[PDB]
């Protein structure tokens, strides 16, 4: 039995899905219908660049939303059974929430667009910060966090796998939990190319901006499981997803619980459905007897179609 994730920010490159769209016409078809909703043509962001444009979170969101869905789409025209689970990283979540039947396709393209402004507006550039952990447990990361705060906020905002762990927060407080990490045993606290400090709490006010927006939008009963970044819950309630929606903003991405979960369900194996190998990677890091492997390429879709 299988799952299908869907990768989140990161997971971007120009290019990417090229391979697919030459044998598959469904996948510019799908980033037409996007590039309707957006008011611009996506597949030529994606294809063209430049990478500055592709990486800007309002922009990065529905290409990767529609990417994602356009590969989906690409599995079903070909013949592919659901899968028994879906979930989603960060942005993700939206993926398998439309492959889900949750939300319509071009609603969730422009939800997402206005997650990612919502995002890029919520503090002054320069104020915010991501930092990577490496090497160190959850608990004693969520601790050195703590003593780091002094009033400003720093969180575990990504828990990604064992021994990977984002953090992010107002960027003082990121450098002292980094050094607080590294104190407490961690191999690296590396800086990342954040700005946007997301999954913690500065980013309260643009959750409460998100909710108005999806309260605008209809939402239906899923048609496959999706477990959720928050709660790491497959929930039903239309109005219980849009819900969890809200708090997965301001709240850390539990991935490594999530494919726990899906594991303790009876997965064995994760088809990545999206561009790049990122949550490929992470699979074995944290269950080592899964497997995972990408459906980006036109060759691995047709071994996969096989089976």
Same mark, same amino acid.
């Given at each position: 039995?299988?799952?299908?994730?869907?990768?989140?920010?990161?997971?971007?490159?120009?290019?990417?899905?090229?391979?697919?769209?030459?044998?598959?016409?469904?996948?510019?078809?799908?980033?037409?219908?996007?590039?309707?909703?957006? +008011?611009?043509?996506?597949?030529?962001?994606?294809?063209?660049?430049?990478?500055?444009?592709?990486?800007?979170?309002?922009?990065?969101?529905?290409?990767?939303?529609?990417?994602?869905?356009?590969?989906?789409?690409?599995?079903?025209?070909?013949?592919?059974?659901?899968?028994?689970?879906?979930?989603?990283?960060?942005?993700?979540?939206?993926?398998?929430?439309?492959?889900?039947?949750?939300?319509?396709?071009?609603?969730?393209?422009?939800?997402?667009?206005?997650? +990612?402004?919502?995002?890029?507006?919520?503090?002054?550039? +320069?104020?915010?910060?991501?930092?990577?952990?490496?090497?160190?447990?959850?608990?004693?990361?969520?601790?050195?966090?703590?003593?780091?705060?002094?009033?400003?906020?720093?969180?575990?905002?990504?828990?990604?796998?064992?021994?990977?762990?984002?953090?992010?927060?107002? %960027?003082?407080?990121?450098?002292?939990?980094?050094?607080?990490?590294?104190?407490?045993?961690? /191999?690296?606290?590396?800086?990342?190319?954040?700005?946007?400090?997301?999954?913690?709490?500065?980013? /309260?006010?643009?959750?409460? %901006?998100?909710?108005? @927006?999806?309260? %605008?939008?209809?939402?239906?009963?899923?048609?496959?499981?999706?477990?959720?970044?928050?709660?790491? %819950?497959? @929930?039903?309630?239309?109005?219980?997803?849009?819900?969890?929606?809200?708090?997965?903003?301001?709240?850390?991405?539990?991935?490594?619980?999530?494919? @726990?979960?899906?594991?303790?369900?009876?997965?064995?194996?994760?088809?990545?459905?999206?561009?790049? /190998?990122?949550?490929? +990677?992470?699979?074995?890091?944290?269950?080592?007897?899964?497997?995972?492997?990408?459906?980006?390429?036109?060759?691995?879709?047709?071994?996969?179609?096989?089976?």
């Amino acid at each position: 039995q299988f799952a299908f994730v869907f990768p989140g920010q990161g997971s971007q490159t120009v290019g990417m899905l090229a391979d697919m769209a030459a044998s598959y016409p469904i996948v510019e078809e799908t980033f037409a219908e996007a590039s309707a909703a957006l +008011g611009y043509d996506l597949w030529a962001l994606t294809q063209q660049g430049p990478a500055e444009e592709l990486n800007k979170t309002w922009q990065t969101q529905p290409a990767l939303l529609t990417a994602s869905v356009a590969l989906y789409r690409v599995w079903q025209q070909q013949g592919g059974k659901a899968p028994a689970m879906m979930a989603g990283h960060s942005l993700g979540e939206y993926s398998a929430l439309v492959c889900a039947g949750v939300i319509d396709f071009a609603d969730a393209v422009r939800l997402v667009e206005m997650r +990612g402004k919502f995002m890029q507006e919520a503090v002054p550039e +320069g104020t915010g910060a991501m930092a990577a952990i490496i090497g160190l447990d959850d608990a004693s990361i969520a601790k050195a966090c703590e003593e780091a705060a002094e009033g400003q906020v720093v969180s575990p905002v990504n828990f990604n796998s064992p021994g990977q762990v984002v953090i992010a927060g107002h %960027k003082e407080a990121v450098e002292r939990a980094g050094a607080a990490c590294k104190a407490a045993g961690a /191999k690296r606290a590396l800086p990342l190319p954040v700005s946007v400090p997301s999954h913690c709490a500065l980013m /309260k006010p643009a959750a409460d %901006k998100l909710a108005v @927006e999806l309260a %605008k939008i209809t939402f239906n009963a899923p048609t496959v499981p999706v477990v959720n970044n928050v709660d790491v %819950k497959c @929930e039903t309630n239309g109005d219980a997803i849009r819900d969890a929606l809200v708090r997965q903003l301001y709240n850390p991405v539990q991935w490594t619980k999530s494919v @726990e979960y899906m594991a303790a369900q009876g997965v064995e194996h994760l088809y990545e459905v999206g561009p790049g /190998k990122v949550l490929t +990677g992470l699979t074995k890091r944290i269950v080592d007897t899964l497997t995972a492997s990408a459906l980006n390429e036109p060759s691995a879709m047709a071994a996969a179609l096989e089976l």
